[PDB]
Amino acid sequence: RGHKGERQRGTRPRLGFEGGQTPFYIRIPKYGFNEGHSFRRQYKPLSLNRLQYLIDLGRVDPSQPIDLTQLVNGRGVTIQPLKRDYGVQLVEEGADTFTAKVNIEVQLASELAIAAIEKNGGVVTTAFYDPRSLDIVCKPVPFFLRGQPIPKRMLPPEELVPYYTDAKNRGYLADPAKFPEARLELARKYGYILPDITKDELFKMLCTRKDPRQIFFGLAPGWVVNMADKKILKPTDENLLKYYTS
Amino acid sequence: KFTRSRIPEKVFQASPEDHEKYGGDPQNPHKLHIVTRIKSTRRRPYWEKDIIKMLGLEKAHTPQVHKNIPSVNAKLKVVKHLIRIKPLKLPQGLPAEENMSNTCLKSTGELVVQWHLKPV
Amino acid sequence: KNLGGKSSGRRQGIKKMEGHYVHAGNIIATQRHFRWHPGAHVGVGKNKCLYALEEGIVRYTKEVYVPHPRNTEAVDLITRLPKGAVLYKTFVHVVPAKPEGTFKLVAML
Amino acid sequence: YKKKWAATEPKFPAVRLALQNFDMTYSVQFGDLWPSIRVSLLSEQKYGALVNNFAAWDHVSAKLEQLSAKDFVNEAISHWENLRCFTFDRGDISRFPPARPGSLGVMEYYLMDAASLLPVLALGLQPGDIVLDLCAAPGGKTLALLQTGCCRNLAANDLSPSRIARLQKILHSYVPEEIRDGNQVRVTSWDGRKWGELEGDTYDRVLVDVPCTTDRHSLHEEENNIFKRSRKKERQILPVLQVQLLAAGLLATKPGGHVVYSTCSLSHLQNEYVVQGAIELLANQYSIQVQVEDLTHFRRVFMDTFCFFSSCQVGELVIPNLMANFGPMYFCKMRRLT
RNA sequence: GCCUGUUUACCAAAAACAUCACCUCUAGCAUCACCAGUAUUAGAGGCACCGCCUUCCUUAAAUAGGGAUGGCUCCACGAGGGUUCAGCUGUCUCUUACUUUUAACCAGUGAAAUUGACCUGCCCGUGAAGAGGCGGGCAUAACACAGCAAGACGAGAAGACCCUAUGGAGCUUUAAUUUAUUAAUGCAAACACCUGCAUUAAAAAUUUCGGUUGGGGCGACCUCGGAGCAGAACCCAACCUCCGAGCAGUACAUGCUAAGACUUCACCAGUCAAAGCGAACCUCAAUUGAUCCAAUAACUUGACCAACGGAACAAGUUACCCUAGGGAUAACAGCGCAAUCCUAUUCUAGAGUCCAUAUCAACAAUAGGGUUUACGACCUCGAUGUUGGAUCAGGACAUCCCGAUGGUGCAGCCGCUAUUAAAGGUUCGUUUGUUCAACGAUUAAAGUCCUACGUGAUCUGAGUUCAGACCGGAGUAAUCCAGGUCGGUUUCUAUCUACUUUAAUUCCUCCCUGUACGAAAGGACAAGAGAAAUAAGGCCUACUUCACAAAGCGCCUUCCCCCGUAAAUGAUAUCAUCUCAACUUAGUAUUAUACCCACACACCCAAGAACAGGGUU
RNA sequence: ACCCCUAUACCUUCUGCAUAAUGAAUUAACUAGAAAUAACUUUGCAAGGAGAGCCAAAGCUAAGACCCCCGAAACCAGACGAGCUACCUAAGAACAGCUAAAAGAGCACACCCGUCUAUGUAGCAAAAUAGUGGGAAGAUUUAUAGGUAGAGGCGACAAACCUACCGAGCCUGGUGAUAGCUGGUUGUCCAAGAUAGAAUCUUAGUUCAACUUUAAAUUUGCCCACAGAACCCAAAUCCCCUUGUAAAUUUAACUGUUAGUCCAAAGAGGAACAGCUCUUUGGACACUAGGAAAAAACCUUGUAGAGAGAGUAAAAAAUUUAACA
Ligand SMILES: Nc1nc2c(ncn2[C@@H]2O[C@H](COP(=O)(O)OP(=O)(O)OP(=O)(O)O)[C@@H](O)[C@H]2O)c(=O)[nH]1
Ligand SMILES: [Mg+2]
Ligand SMILES: [Mg+2]
Ligand SMILES: [Mg+2]
Ligand SMILES: [Mg+2]
Ligand SMILES: [Mg+2]
Ligand SMILES: [Mg+2]
Ligand SMILES: [Mg+2]
Ligand SMILES: [Mg+2]
Ligand SMILES: [Mg+2]
Ligand SMILES: [Mg+2]
Ligand SMILES: [Mg+2]
Ligand SMILES: [Mg+2]
Ligand SMILES: [Mg+2]
Ligand SMILES: [Mg+2]
Ligand SMILES: [Mg+2]
Ligand SMILES: [Mg+2]
Ligand SMILES: [Mg+2]
Ligand SMILES: [Mg+2]
Ligand SMILES: [Mg+2]
Ligand SMILES: [Mg+2]
Ligand SMILES: [Mg+2]
Ligand SMILES: [Mg+2]
Ligand SMILES: [Mg+2]
Ligand SMILES: [Mg+2]
Ligand SMILES: [Mg+2]
Ligand SMILES: [Mg+2]
Ligand SMILES: [Mg+2]
Ligand SMILES: [Mg+2]
Ligand SMILES: [Mg+2]
Ligand SMILES: [Mg+2]
Ligand SMILES: [Mg+2]
Ligand SMILES: [Mg+2]
Ligand SMILES: [Mg+2]
Ligand SMILES: [Mg+2]
Ligand SMILES: [Mg+2]
Ligand SMILES: [Mg+2]
Ligand SMILES: [Mg+2]
Ligand SMILES: [Mg+2]
């Protein structure tokens, strides 16, 4: 412990104290480096390399629509809604080697990622999720054990509304009429012929898209999943039906 | 202040009297020094200590063979006051591989290539 | 009754001696007044610091000193010299090492 | 050290110490005039506006005349049988508006004590005279000299770099750079005592405004008061330094040249004994004879504006009065006969 | 100080507090004090009754004592503080005798502080600087018993005193922050009281009282820059030597960006800058200030935050003090040093009527000492105040006297000066703490020093040091003071070391002798005799205190040198020469002796603490 | 056995202690290093790890490993205390004798007090004894019960007293208060290991740097030949290929040391004093041994054991002086 003094007595000053000189961590001006950090939205990256790897190993089935639930089930991505994770963002990394035809739903998507997905004949749609709906999506089984009716998926916040209503981003709220124009623009920009998916035998699966207020593909808001006896209880009261349809 | 000492070059210019006294010929100078540390490096500057360590003279009265070349000579000049320097004499030339294991360094500075330990 | 005089040393002087390899922009020497004058490929800062304008080897030489004619005090000092006298000063030069680029085959059109 | 003392001398402000000294001395010196001098010194100081000859001197003079100030120098020259400084009438307390830069880029006028101009006027700068200001570096007299016609150069010296910087700033503000560029103005930060050795028999006109008790400033300003206890040594040795400076100026001035010794204090010791001791020291150690010029005609000419201590042996003493709060100013003119 | 009284229970009993009397201020009044009162009353306070106005003496000697609205005025009183006549007396000169207690031995009972271990010596030197333990010498069988207090920097309170702590606490304030609380008012609310909000006071509450320097002051400094110290890469302190700055001027591309580097020894901060965009075709020493926080739409701006890496806002005093520490830091002391101080030589300047050197002595030079005034901060702040005095003294000689010599401005006597000599001695009184000093009277002399400015476990506490209180002064006050004064707790049973029975000196008187010397006036040595005094050692026949004995004030005995020089003979150097030449005298220490000398129960004793010793015929 | 030679107890605090600096009589018992962050090692699994949450650009999970004891004066809250003492309330008691007469009178008992001296000083006594002394009909002394309580009381103010220690009682609790200050900090053995400074209400401390330790990475580290580093107005240093060498830099983690001494040299201050005070270069000391007498700093010498072998290092002071014509 040394010889005498505060260090041997066990009473040396607090960490960051500099013997009375204005400490380093206090003489530096305050700057908004971390302002609103707990409110900034975070999106886990999902590179096309990772997506192709998952598809190849079979942890993600491209024969069915790919959404956050499927990704989490395949363990392709880990989501932490409590840590302000708002979903998954498609990442162009691996675009040049992506050769899978998939119908993938994400929260954000880069222009290049969309281009690669569409060139390979697939469909990509950017879908918003509120924190609660996102938690339910990522871990549905615990939610079903909570014993609550499936809630409505909240609409995007005002700032995010333009993104999810813009067709160029394949927003799930965007006008479907503008989708062909955007796809043709991407094909022309990136020099690949747009494949007419309508002729594909999996066109139905590619076209399947959950309703904006819907969380799971086949389950409507308000339903209760009784896993113990493998049943689904659907409310019939007109007020409840109206609320869950709104 | 106490500092490193620069020895004037005239100190290291032997005279004919020195040649006669010490039995060395300026032409055909000896090739190798036998250097022994006869003085402690304690109470001497750290640079002299380091020079002794570099020359490998940590142990006193332990001869060490060094090249008689200007750089080694400069080091030996730096630490000349702690060492005894003598020429290495080779009456039977440098040892061959055959007799490399039978050599001995005489106190006179001669490396004998045969060491029988028997009366002459 | 004597106050002040507690200023610390400026740590000025030569930062690169002769023969040291010096990259472009490196400060060669800092001086309070012109102990060493800029040579070839050596620039001068506001505070009379010498920095290397090219990547090369530093060399210190002695050269005749002919100041700018607009430098009135130096011109007058020279005007007062005798006919045979020629002023000399210590100059620092950077002998550039690499060439400023090479021609490479890019395409065999 | 000894912490607990028996009795500590009362802590006096330097202003009150200066009042004590000035009372105990000038009361004896001036008798019944000391009350008036004391009240004048403790009252506001009357300022004069010296119009910058380099600037639009005529326009500034007209503006001051409209402000009802009259040129005391002009009226003095009227009955004397180049300077223009306007002052208000006797008894008036009006303040001159703060001086501002003119069209030419130089300040229109300088607000300075009118009495401070009398030394320069008495110096009588002839056209093209080489001039020295041994220690006068508050401004004022220096600017007046420059505005005068000493085109043969003026060497203004002081021992205080701060006052040298102040002189330089006022010169930048008032004197054109065209005038100041040549050797016409040489400002130096050297000791006047060494000036006798540095230059001898060189200047035709010399002004030695020695450091003094500056009675008014000592009474008003608390900062750097000469009468504070710490500066007791300097206060005590002041007469010797003043004698040395006047001797240096007398040595510097050319034979037959004129010098003026100026002091901003009432002290007989610091004025008349200083000049007399300088004369004696110069005539003994250096064997040079100096004759004191008669300034009585100067007194009569300028009496209408300034009140003078009639009972003065050598030189002139403008005393501050309430009707004209222009003093204090002692000035003695001395021509070096040998 | 009017007086009687009161007070720090447990260091101060007083001049301090109170006190009648006098004076100042406040209050016009009732159902719990004041008061069951009412301005001749009650409360708070000052001051102190009453009354009145406006160089000489003492001593012989004297730092003692006395006299030549407020201010005077001592009648009485006082365990108050000084001075004093006379008497008194063991206070003392100068101590003695006896009784009791204590004490020592025998018997019973039986602690305390203390203690690293001890097989526990002296001298010199050394050393964390004053050693039983180390070095060199010397000494040295073993143990008890009784005394002593020089040492164990002895034992007792993490002594006294001083300094430090971003330790306390008491007190005062024009230190900072408040007015929560009361008392007033004002505005609201209600229709004076109550409540809310303001303002002003009283009263208090919380907290602080920076740092480095300066002992004889009346403060200086704290940040930045240049120069020497620091000569030549860099770096370099100072309670070192000097000098400066807290800006100004220009310009408005003094715009934006960016490689690479420097950097005040950290960081923070501070510097330079290629290329590029866009344009044209800053200077020099320092010239300053972080974060937070304020103002601002933004750009930006804001502390002489100068204690200048900057607590957002806090001073004094403490001796009424407290705690934690410090020999890291003071004063006594020790220990270094020798500036200062003292002593001695060299030089001869000059004095000495002439004459350097009888004697004194300038400028200076060389040594020696560690007695002064300082400087240093090395031991001791985990119970040692200090100065004087008492007691006992040990030691040096640089000698005050006594002894022996040389010189002399040495006729003799007085002297002056120098060499040698430390065996012995070196007084008593007045003032005053006082060492010192002055004064009185003496002496042969009334020596200079060291010894922890010797010694305080041997004593005293008179000055000085805490608590109390006055005068003078500083301070707003609390308080303070190198000043004056009155008072003020001085413990220790001894474990260890050490120690506890070891041939005198001087003055005066006479003789020589009013002799030598001298002109006289004066006036000697040497030798001898007589008287004393002190010191040592004994004793009681007287006297005295007293009484089968112990004592002094009484009586008795006290005995040899020491060497500095003056000479004879005589060479080196045929004279001469006293000879670190041989040698001959004054010249002797090699104290001369004296004292002591027997190995062998009980009672008494002039022997004794016990033990021991002597007698018992 | 002693005699002979060698040997200056220990701990702590220090630049340095046998030190005549602290603690310790001694025996037994008890008595003092508690932990995150990030690292390192070892596993598991692995672009995933984890038994929800969390982390992830080889990570992640788990474990191992790491941070003392005693001591203040103090502050605040609530109780308890006026059987002592300060003052007061109720209702009581005492005051011989003499003198003077109606007395805050005089002398002097009881009584109260405590001036001075001596003793005592762990005592008879945590304030006493003997003598001496002040008051002793008053503002006196005193028995009984009651009252005033602590940012308070009471006080003829002495900062007096309030249950032996009041500048603010005592007890309990907050409380294991805090302490940059003192002291202490307990098995064996080996190894590396000592001071550039800056800032600081800071100089008794601490943060950074410097030094030091450990582990890891790769690559030059030291010594150093020329050449080279200013004009104004010495010793040396810097840079530095060879060469002799084997260390250096970087990365990760972390304490500790930053109140130093003397000697040689260059200086500054003092007085060309100090075992005096500062700065610089080097040495030694804080580390073994030998020598200089004893000996931290001078000289020799170091890397560690046994030997009843040997060669050496440093290492012992020198000097004696005046004739003359
Ligand atoms: N940067 C800066 N901050 C300031 C300045 N003056 C005050 N402050 C801020 O305010 C603090 C000082 O507070 P005060 O001393 O009360 O300031 P003041 O201006 O004197 O007075 P108030 O206005 O009453 O606070 C600083 O620590 C800053 O937070 C200034 O000149 N510059
Ligand atoms: Mg400790
Ligand atoms: Mg400097
Ligand atoms: Mg009285
Ligand atoms: Mg009385
Ligand atoms: Mg008492
Ligand atoms: Mg009492
Ligand atoms: Mg008493
Ligand atoms: Mg008397
Ligand atoms: Mg017994
Ligand atoms: Mg001794
Ligand atoms: Mg005994
Ligand atoms: Mg001892
Ligand atoms: Mg203590
Ligand atoms: Mg740096
Ligand atoms: Mg500071
Ligand atoms: Mg007092
Ligand atoms: Mg010291
Ligand atoms: Mg003698
Ligand atoms: Mg002494
Ligand atoms: Mg006394
Ligand atoms: Mg006194
Ligand atoms: Mg007294
Ligand atoms: Mg008394
Ligand atoms: Mg005693
Ligand atoms: Mg005794
Ligand atoms: Mg001890
Ligand atoms: Mg201690
Ligand atoms: Mg003890
Ligand atoms: Mg009672
Ligand atoms: Mg009676
Ligand atoms: Mg009575
Ligand atoms: Mg009472
Ligand atoms: Mg009092
Ligand atoms: Mg008091
Ligand atoms: Mg009590
Ligand atoms: Mg504690
Ligand atoms: Mg080791
Ligand atoms: Mg600060």
Coordinates of N, CA, C and O in Angstrom, one line a residue, chain D residues 212-289:
Chain D
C212 N 7.7 64.1 -10.8 CA 7.5 65.0 -9.7 C 6.3 64.4 -8.9 O 5.8 63.3 -9.2
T213 N 5.9 65.1 -7.8 CA 4.8 64.6 -7.0 C 3.4 64.7 -7.7 O 2.5 64.1 -7.2
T214 N 3.4 65.4 -8.9 CA 2.1 65.5 -9.6 C 0.9 65.7 -8.7 O 0.0 64.9 -8.7
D215 N 1.0 66.9 -8.0 CA 0.1 67.0 -6.8 C -1.3 66.7 -7.1 O -2.0 65.9 -6.3
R216 N -1.9 67.2 -8.2 CA -3.3 66.9 -8.5 C -3.6 65.4 -8.7 O -4.5 64.9 -8.1
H217 N -2.7 64.8 -9.5 CA -2.9 63.3 -9.7 C -2.7 62.5 -8.5 O -3.4 61.5 -8.3
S218 N -1.8 62.9 -7.6 CA -1.6 62.3 -6.4 C -2.8 62.4 -5.5 O -3.2 61.4 -4.8
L219 N -3.4 63.6 -5.5 CA -4.6 63.8 -4.6 C -5.8 63.1 -5.2 O -6.7 62.7 -4.4
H220 N -5.9 62.8 -6.5 CA -7.1 62.2 -7.1 C -6.9 60.7 -7.3 O -7.7 60.0 -6.7
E221 N -5.9 60.3 -8.0 CA -5.8 58.9 -8.3 C -5.1 58.1 -7.1 O -4.1 58.5 -6.6
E222 N -5.8 57.0 -6.7 CA -5.2 56.2 -5.7 C -4.1 55.3 -6.2 O -3.1 55.0 -5.5
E223 N -4.2 54.9 -7.5 CA -3.3 53.9 -8.1 C -1.9 54.6 -8.4 O -1.9 55.7 -8.9
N224 N -0.9 53.9 -8.0 CA 0.5 54.3 -8.3 C 0.7 55.7 -7.7 O 1.3 56.6 -8.4
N225 N 0.2 56.0 -6.5 CA 0.4 57.3 -5.9 C 1.8 57.4 -5.3 O 2.3 56.5 -4.6
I226 N 2.5 58.5 -5.7 CA 3.9 58.7 -5.2 C 3.9 58.7 -3.7 O 5.0 58.4 -3.1
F227 N 2.9 59.1 -3.0 CA 2.9 59.3 -1.6 C 2.5 58.0 -0.8 O 2.4 58.1 0.4
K228 N 2.4 56.9 -1.5 CA 2.2 55.6 -0.7 C 3.4 55.2 0.0 O 4.6 55.6 -0.4
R229 N 3.3 54.5 1.1 CA 4.4 54.2 1.9 C 5.5 53.4 1.2 O 6.7 53.6 1.3
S230 N 5.1 52.4 0.4 CA 6.0 51.6 -0.3 C 7.0 52.4 -1.2 O 8.2 52.0 -1.3
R231 N 6.5 53.5 -1.8 CA 7.3 54.3 -2.6 C 8.0 55.5 -1.9 O 8.3 56.5 -2.4
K232 N 8.2 55.3 -0.6 CA 8.8 56.3 0.2 C 10.2 56.6 -0.2 O 10.7 57.8 -0.3
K233 N 11.0 55.6 -0.6 CA 12.3 55.8 -1.1 C 12.3 56.6 -2.3 O 13.1 57.6 -2.5
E234 N 11.5 56.3 -3.3 CA 11.4 57.1 -4.5 C 11.0 58.5 -4.2 O 11.6 59.5 -4.8
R235 N 10.0 58.7 -3.4 CA 9.6 60.1 -3.0 C 10.7 60.9 -2.4 O 10.9 62.0 -2.7
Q236 N 11.5 60.2 -1.5 CA 12.6 60.9 -0.8 C 13.7 61.3 -1.8 O 14.3 62.4 -1.8
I237 N 14.0 60.4 -2.8 CA 15.1 60.6 -3.7 C 14.7 61.4 -4.9 O 15.6 61.8 -5.7
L238 N 13.4 61.7 -5.0 CA 13.0 62.5 -6.2 C 13.8 63.8 -6.5 O 14.2 64.0 -7.6
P239 N 14.1 64.6 -5.5 CA 14.9 65.8 -5.8 C 16.2 65.5 -6.5 O 16.6 66.2 -7.4
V240 N 16.9 64.5 -6.0 CA 18.2 64.2 -6.6 C 18.1 63.7 -8.1 O 18.8 64.2 -9.0
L241 N 17.0 62.9 -8.3 CA 16.8 62.5 -9.7 C 16.4 63.7 -10.6 O 16.8 63.8 -11.8
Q242 N 15.6 64.6 -10.1 CA 15.2 65.8 -10.9 C 16.5 66.6 -11.2 O 16.6 67.1 -12.3
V243 N 17.3 66.8 -10.2 CA 18.6 67.6 -10.4 C 19.4 66.9 -11.5 O 20.0 67.5 -12.4
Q244 N 19.5 65.6 -11.4 CA 20.3 64.8 -12.4 C 19.7 65.0 -13.8 O 20.5 65.2 -14.8
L245 N 18.4 64.9 -13.9 CA 17.8 65.0 -15.2 C 18.0 66.5 -15.8 O 18.3 66.6 -17.0
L246 N 17.8 67.5 -14.9 CA 18.0 68.8 -15.4 C 19.4 69.1 -15.8 O 19.7 69.8 -16.8
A247 N 20.4 68.5 -15.1 CA 21.8 68.6 -15.4 C 22.1 68.0 -16.8 O 22.8 68.5 -17.6
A248 N 21.5 66.8 -17.0 CA 21.7 66.1 -18.3 C 21.1 66.9 -19.4 O 21.7 67.0 -20.5
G249 N 19.9 67.5 -19.2 CA 19.4 68.4 -20.3 C 20.2 69.6 -20.5 O 20.4 70.0 -21.7
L250 N 20.8 70.2 -19.5 CA 21.6 71.4 -19.7 C 22.9 71.0 -20.4 O 23.4 71.8 -21.2
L251 N 23.5 69.8 -20.1 CA 24.6 69.3 -20.8 C 24.3 69.1 -22.3 O 25.1 69.5 -23.2
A252 N 23.1 68.5 -22.5 CA 22.7 68.2 -23.9 C 22.5 69.5 -24.7 O 23.0 69.6 -25.9
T253 N 21.9 70.5 -24.2 CA 21.6 71.7 -25.0 C 22.8 72.4 -25.5 O 23.9 72.4 -24.8
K254 N 22.7 73.0 -26.7 CA 23.9 73.6 -27.3 C 24.2 74.9 -26.5 O 23.4 75.5 -25.8
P255 N 25.5 75.3 -26.5 CA 25.8 76.6 -25.9 C 25.0 77.7 -26.5 O 24.9 77.8 -27.8
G256 N 24.4 78.6 -25.7 CA 23.5 79.6 -26.2 C 22.1 79.0 -26.4 O 21.2 79.8 -26.8
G257 N 21.9 77.7 -26.2 CA 20.6 77.1 -26.3 C 19.7 77.3 -25.1 O 20.2 77.5 -24.0
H258 N 18.4 77.1 -25.3 CA 17.4 77.3 -24.2 C 16.9 76.0 -23.7 O 16.6 75.0 -24.5
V259 N 16.7 75.9 -22.4 CA 16.0 74.7 -21.8 C 14.9 75.3 -20.9 O 14.9 76.4 -20.5
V260 N 13.9 74.4 -20.7 CA 12.8 74.7 -19.8 C 12.6 73.5 -18.9 O 12.3 72.4 -19.4
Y261 N 12.7 73.8 -17.6 CA 12.5 72.8 -16.6 C 11.1 72.9 -16.1 O 10.7 74.0 -15.6
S262 N 10.3 71.8 -16.2 CA 8.9 71.9 -15.9 C 8.5 70.8 -14.8 O 9.1 69.8 -14.7
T263 N 7.6 71.2 -13.9 CA 7.2 70.4 -12.8 C 5.7 70.5 -12.6 O 5.2 71.7 -12.6
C264 N 5.0 69.4 -12.3 CA 3.6 69.5 -12.0 C 3.4 69.4 -10.5 O 2.6 68.6 -10.0
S265 N 4.0 70.3 -9.7 CA 4.0 70.3 -8.3 C 4.2 71.7 -7.7 O 4.8 72.5 -8.4
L266 N 3.7 71.9 -6.5 CA 3.9 73.2 -5.9 C 5.2 73.3 -5.1 O 5.5 74.4 -4.6
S267 N 5.9 72.2 -5.0 CA 7.0 72.1 -4.0 C 8.1 73.0 -4.3 O 8.8 72.8 -5.4
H268 N 8.4 74.0 -3.5 CA 9.6 74.8 -3.6 C 10.8 73.9 -3.7 O 11.7 74.2 -4.5
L269 N 10.9 72.9 -2.8 CA 12.0 72.0 -2.9 C 12.2 71.4 -4.3 O 13.3 71.4 -4.8
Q270 N 11.1 70.9 -4.8 CA 11.2 70.2 -6.1 C 11.3 71.1 -7.3 O 11.6 70.7 -8.4
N271 N 11.1 72.4 -7.1 CA 11.2 73.4 -8.3 C 12.4 74.3 -8.2 O 13.3 74.2 -8.9
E272 N 12.4 75.2 -7.1 CA 13.4 76.2 -7.1 C 14.8 75.7 -6.6 O 15.8 76.0 -7.2
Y273 N 14.8 74.9 -5.6 CA 16.0 74.3 -5.1 C 16.5 73.3 -6.2 O 17.7 73.1 -6.4
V274 N 15.6 72.6 -6.9 CA 16.1 71.7 -8.0 C 16.8 72.5 -9.1 O 17.9 72.1 -9.5
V275 N 16.2 73.6 -9.6 CA 16.9 74.3 -10.6 C 18.2 74.9 -10.1 O 19.2 74.9 -10.8
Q276 N 18.2 75.5 -8.9 CA 19.4 76.1 -8.4 C 20.5 75.0 -8.2 O 21.7 75.3 -8.5
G277 N 20.2 73.9 -7.6 CA 21.1 72.8 -7.5 C 21.7 72.3 -8.8 O 22.8 72.0 -9.0
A278 N 20.8 72.2 -9.8 CA 21.3 71.9 -11.2 C 22.2 72.9 -11.7 O 23.3 72.5 -12.2
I279 N 21.9 74.2 -11.6 CA 22.9 75.2 -12.0 C 24.2 75.1 -11.3 O 25.3 75.1 -11.9
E280 N 24.2 74.9 -10.0 CA 25.4 74.8 -9.2 C 26.2 73.6 -9.6 O 27.4 73.7 -9.8
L281 N 25.6 72.5 -9.7 CA 26.3 71.2 -10.1 C 26.9 71.3 -11.5 O 28.0 70.9 -11.7
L282 N 26.1 71.9 -12.4 CA 26.7 72.1 -13.8 C 27.9 73.0 -13.8 O 28.9 72.8 -14.5
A283 N 27.8 74.1 -13.0 CA 28.9 75.1 -13.0 C 30.1 74.6 -12.3 O 31.2 75.1 -12.5
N284 N 29.9 73.7 -11.3 CA 31.1 73.2 -10.6 C 31.7 71.9 -11.2 O 32.8 71.9 -11.6
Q285 N 30.9 70.8 -11.3 CA 31.4 69.6 -11.8 C 31.8 69.7 -13.3 O 32.8 69.1 -13.7
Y286 N 31.0 70.3 -14.1 CA 31.2 70.4 -15.5 C 31.6 71.8 -16.0 O 31.9 72.0 -17.2
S287 N 31.6 72.8 -15.1 CA 32.1 74.1 -15.5 C 31.4 74.7 -16.7 O 32.0 75.1 -17.7
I288 N 30.1 74.8 -16.6 CA 29.2 75.4 -17.6 C 28.3 76.3 -17.0 O 27.6 76.0 -16.0
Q289 N 28.2 77.5 -17.5 CA 27.4 78.6 -16.9 C 26.0 78.7 -17.6 O 25.9 78.8 -18.8

